[PDB]
Amino acid sequence: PDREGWLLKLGGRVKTWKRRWFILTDNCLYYFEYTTDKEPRGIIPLENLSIREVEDPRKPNCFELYNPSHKGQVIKACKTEADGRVVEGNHVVYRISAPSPEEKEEWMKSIKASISRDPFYD
Numbered sequence: 001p002d003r004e005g006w007l008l009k010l011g012g013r014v015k016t017w018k019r020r021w022f023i024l025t026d027n028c029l030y031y032f033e034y035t036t037d038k039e040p041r042g043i044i045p046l047e048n049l050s051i052r053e054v055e056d057p058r059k060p061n062c063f064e065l066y067n068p069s070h071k072g073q074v075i076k077a078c079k080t081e082a083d084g085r086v087v088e089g090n091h092v093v094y095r096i097s098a099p100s101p102e103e104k105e106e107w108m109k110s111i112k113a114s115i116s117r118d119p120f121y122d
């Protein structure tokens, strides 16, 4: 309460990938820069979002997080700036890459189960 591990994340404004430790708990995805950090770098509520496999030109074992009900809106999420101050995220989509084909399978299964497990999923 359900899965943890390293994954790569593509930046919002522009590109550049970053390695972050992710924690799937309470239908939310928390991420940190280092496993020893005391406070979250960000929080992404999973409710009302979907996940799809994608083919990135360079990074293998990828998938994306997006909002199927509001094309064009920024995904509601929290993140901390360099100075530590909290602000809203600016992602319309989140692209992620896993460490191995098996782990990608594991993460997509866990995320889908988490989302569908919600009483409001329908």
Ligand SMILES: O=P(O)(O)O[C@@H]1[C@@H](OP(=O)(O)O)[C@H](OP(=O)(O)O)[C@H](O)[C@H](OP(=O)(O)O)[C@H]1OP(=O)(O)O
Residues within 6 Å of the ligand: 010, 011, 012, 013, 014, 015, 016, 018, 020, 041, 042, 079, 080, 089, 090, 091
């Ligand atoms: O542009 P943003 O939408 O603010 O995304 C930002 C990125 O900004 P850019 O893509 O414009 O370079 C950051 O890149 P950098 O470390 O080079 O500043 C980083 O990639 C950060 O990642 P980090 O918060 O894990 O450090 C993202 O924040 P997110 O958490 O929202 O992805």
